[PDB]
Write a protein that binds this ligand. Structure first.
Ligand SMILES: O=C(O)c1ccc(NS(=O)(=O)c2ccc(N3C(=O)c4ccccc4C3=O)cc2)cc1
Lengths: 238, 269, 56, 238, 238, 56, 56, 56, 56
């Protein structure tokens, strides 16, 4: 006899435990190992890849391939807003179904920079400059380019290399932020304005498009796992 | 760890590792390389989960009996033999001689019996499983002096705990248990046929220690055997025709295979 | 033998001894840290260096 | 007291467990050891031995010694089929009661080559050549010798050494195959055709016989144990 | 917490277990040790001692001191049988209450040679020779001296040293034998015949006696303990 | 003493200490790998070599 | 300390550590093999040698 | 490894081995003795020495 | 560390390791043998020697 007194914690089954176990058929010889291409060892391998953001939404711009394209047109007055959405992945209805956001809905915390690659898919003679600005929370989103400038912006000059990466840096008062909505922490506003209107010659279409891509940086980490809200079931699949 | 294939190539010399009489009672070893050409293939397959022991060391239910806690048969009795269950028996009868230790686990489960008795409440029945070595005393009434377990082993198990377990070593007059005995016990060659004293580990009796509830309760002792430290000699054909008796190899003739259509059909009926 | 390794600390030591015959019954490998995003990200043949444009 | 908390897994009895135990009579002195001939230490010792295959079946060619013999006769047109059965041991009704197949029904997986030794038990003046062909699954069994050739075949020329071993090699897309029927994996077709008709002189019987033997190779392994379906009981043997 | 999972075998009480225990009064100082004469350390110390065998039985030769004496008398025809009993201790009703047999009824197995010392307690002028024969099982006991000779015998010539030890050697096909009756194993027959009739002068009594003693050899061992059948009780001793 | 041996791996280490007086109460010898098919297969007196016919 | 001794084998090793203050609470001494039949058998003063008769 | 440290005595030794992967599941640090009242008491810039008045 | 000491024998060895932080939770000191009857018996100032009378 070796005296023991069972501490409370025994005779329970957690849904996140980890222990030794008794085997079923003992001495079973597991099949060999193949080095099948494209091994994954971390979720940040998957999260650092671009995925097209369906920025546009209306009510039927959310059931077609119209969702992913951001309409850009030549408008004579410059200072018109191209798009605008808050940065609050895994809650925002712009990043709720993207690749980054869908990995993010399994986590409660997130930290790190996020890259928004904007790709001009216009004509090959169309030009234009855009002032892509990210204004941290401190006020309720710019409504003019003259206010958007003050934030952290990047003027994108188009003409070869049809993409320009506006990297949103980490500005937060904490070392993590919630994926779910909260008001102790917020993520500010991402807006785009025309810097210099789309100049399109003759015989070239005057309505172009931009694509928005969301990816994670290498200074990115997620912590505290929970389970998604965007999947459901009623009765078991028969 | 199994063998590996190696590169060969064409063959035009007088070797013919294929052609060889199998009339000599010699089962020839022919590799892929002999009938074709196969490059060097490494095999990491393991021939472990096929060892003699691992094969036989699986707990199989050999039997189960029932005994009322208040009535007539208040005890059950069983002459130990693996010959009561088809499943375990066929595995053992794949070898002529086997030697092993036993692990006896008993899974006792109680069931209330329908009655008109008032206020039936159990106070945790305790069961006694007792091993009586061959040529021991034999209990009759459940209150007999025999149940004092003076030297006879017994497990006392209170219901609602991990099932009782005990080991038995290799107990045989000989040096192996015979799974097939051709011979009589009598010198005049009559009487019992192959009821030799080498696989007769006495009897095992079980009963209710307490008087349980006021009403009747019937308990079901289920016996499990698990061969540890197995050594098996002389392989032999597995049984074909169904078993008929628990001490004889009696059988009714039946098919040699499951039938199909023609000799050249490619689909089983 | 007893495998001793640091507990996952933010910013120590636990004995662990496997007790089962199979190696498919050992506790999960929760600690197993590796990252190598040169796969799915940037799968291009010739790595694009960050100092000039990818295209000519 | 030595603190412990019982992990779930305790207070159960498996039917495949393995642990230390309390003894019954302690200090019992086990009988000596004899080195009785023909010790077995692995099931592959038993499985690598020839057993006669009851290839022929009809309805009364499955209740006699007619089951094991494969009728061969001289037929003027060559290209006639001698026999044909799929290779799918432990399911096929040709290998269901053989020695190899009966060991195989206690396992769910199997891998390795299989040797089919055909032994000509004709007259001692009878001749004949046979094209023994194994055609992997890729189509639904040859119906002509001219199609059977394309597979992996071995032309057996008889005349002394009355057996010839057609070794069926491992051709599978996986490192194991099911013993029980499945259609993700299959084992192809084993056929025999006359290469050159049975020439039998006068006073010698013109109907000969062949015997088929099934054995395992040395590159053979079985994995994952289950329990047979070919044994049954109703009530206990009284 | 030290994770443990209780293997089945726990929470039971065997009647042959052996474990550590909690003490009652702790630190109790046990009384000294005396070296009292005649220490016993093994049951084979007791079993290797002679005990008188009550060979004679009738119905009142089993309630007196007539049981232990074997009547010997001068009979003119030689080849008369003096006694005869099978060797099957702990079952035979000749050795059922002897010292060897009573130790033997607590065991299921036994192995080893057995010594039968016959002591002539006749007159001091009486002579006689006896052919003491042990015939192994192979037939159903001799009924003539001419058949008894063929076995393993010892002719005892009397005249000083009034005892002669017929040692029965181990002849068995197994390394143990049952104490309880069985027919897979048997122990043969021990008989005594007159070799040369009892010659007794005048004035000396013509009826002498022999005593039979049963003892174990030094090549003797018992294995597998059970509990006796020759003791009983009804209600507790008040 | 503590017997340490590799877990049966496909392609590590477990302490095991016998705690009972008898050696008939130790855990099964599930690992015990040996193969020697020169018995039931090829029991012939003079081994037939694979390069010529068995009979003359 | 841990007392290691062979399990009773017919034809290995178990740790055992006493855990109680008293030495009257230790497990039975099932292994304790000795035999010395020069006591009850042959208790005679002068040992009779097997080569001649005991009496003159 | 086993961390051995004296039991909190008034005026000895206990093994303790962490058994869990996380370091947030180890037993509380009940022993952790430190005192440094130069904080809340006497937070002044220039320490007042006990031998003269604080003010001039 | 493991404190090994003989079991109280009349006329051996048990490991004991304290597992609790406090030293007021260790098992009783049942073994603690001392005797010194020069207290209550013979408390006199000048010890009376057994060879003459105490008084003059
Ligand atoms: O279990 C066994 O060990 C045990 C049970 C029955 C037994 N058989 S007996 O020797 O016939 C026997 C039969 C009955 C009693 N017995 C009584 O008659 C009784 C009345 C009231 C209180 C107790 C008891 C009690 O024990 C004692 C011994 C021996 C031992």
């Amino acid at each position: 006899g070796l005296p023991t007194m069972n501490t409370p914690g025994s005779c329970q089954f957690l849904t996140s435990d980890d222990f030794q176990s008794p085997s079923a058929m003992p001495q079973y010889d597991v099949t060999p190992e193949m080095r099948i291409p494209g091994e994954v060892k971390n979720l940040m391998e998957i999260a650092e890849v671009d995925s097209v953001v369906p920025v546009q939404n209306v009510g039927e711009k959310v059931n077609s391939m119209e969702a992913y394209q951001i309409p850009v047109r030549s408008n004579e007055g410059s200072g018109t807003q191209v798009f605008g959405f808050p940065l609050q992945p895994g809650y925002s209805s712009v990043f709720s179904r993207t690749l980054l956001g869908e990995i993010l809905n399994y986590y409660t915390h997130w930290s790190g920079s996020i890259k928004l690659t904007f790709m001009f898919c216009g004509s090959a003679m169309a030009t234009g400059k855009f002032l892509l600005a990210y204004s941290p929370p401190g006020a309720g989103a710019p409504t003019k380019r003259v206010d958007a400038m003050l934030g952290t912006h990047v003027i994108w000059d188009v003409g070869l290399q049809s993409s320009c990466v506006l990297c949103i840096p980490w500005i937060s008062q904490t070392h993590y932020r919630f994926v779910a909505s909260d008001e102790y922490t917020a993520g500010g506003f991402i807006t785009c304005w025309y810097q210099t209107n789309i100049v399109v010659p003759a015989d070239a279409q005057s309505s172009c498009y931009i694509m928005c891509f969301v990816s994670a940086c290498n200074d990115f980490s997620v912590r505290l796992l929970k389970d998604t809200p965007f999947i459901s079931q009623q009765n078991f699949f028969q | 760890r199994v063998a590996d294939t190696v590169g060969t190539g064409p063959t035009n010399s007088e070797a013919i590792p294929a052609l060889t009489a199998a009339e000599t009672g010699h089962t020839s070893q022919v590799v892929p390389g002999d009938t074709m050409q196969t490059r060097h293939v490494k095999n990491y397959h393991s021939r472990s989960e096929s060892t003699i022991e691992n094969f036989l060391c699986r707990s199989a239910c050999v039997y189960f009996t029932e005994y009322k806690n208040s009535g007539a048969k208040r005890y059950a009795e069983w002459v130990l033999t693996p010959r009561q269950a088809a499943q375990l028996r066929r595995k053992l009868e794949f070898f002529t001689y086997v030697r092993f230790d036993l692990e006896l686990t008993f899974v006792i489960t109680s069931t209330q019996q329908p009655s008109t008795t008032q206020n039936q409440d159990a106070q945790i029945l305790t069961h006694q499983i007792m091993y009586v070595p061959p040529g021991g005393p034999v209990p009759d009434k459940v209150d007999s002096y025999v149940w004092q377990t003076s030297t006879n082993p017994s497990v006392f198990w209170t219901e609602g705990n991990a099932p009782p377990r005990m080991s038995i070593p290799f107990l045989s007059i000989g040096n192996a248990y015979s799974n097939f005995y051709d011979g009589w016990s009598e010198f005049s060659r009559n009487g019992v046929y192959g009821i030799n004293t080498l696989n007769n580990m006495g009897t095992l009796y079980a009963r209710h220690v307490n008087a349980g509830s006021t009403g009747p309760i019937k308990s079901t002792i289920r016996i499990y055997f698990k061969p540890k430290h197995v050594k098996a000699w002389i392989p032999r054909p597995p049984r074909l025709c169904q078993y008929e008796k628990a001490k004889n190899v009696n059988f009714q003739p039946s098919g040699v295979t499951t039938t199909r259509q023609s000799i050249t059909t490619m689909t089983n009926t | 033998g007893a495998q001793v390794s640091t507990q996952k600390t933010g910013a120590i030591h636990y004995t662990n001894i496997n007790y089962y015959k199979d190696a498919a019954s050992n506790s999960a490998n929760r600690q197993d840290f590796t990252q190598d995003p040169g796969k799915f990200t940037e799968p291009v043949k010739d790595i694009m260096i960050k100092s000039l444009p990818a295209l000519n």
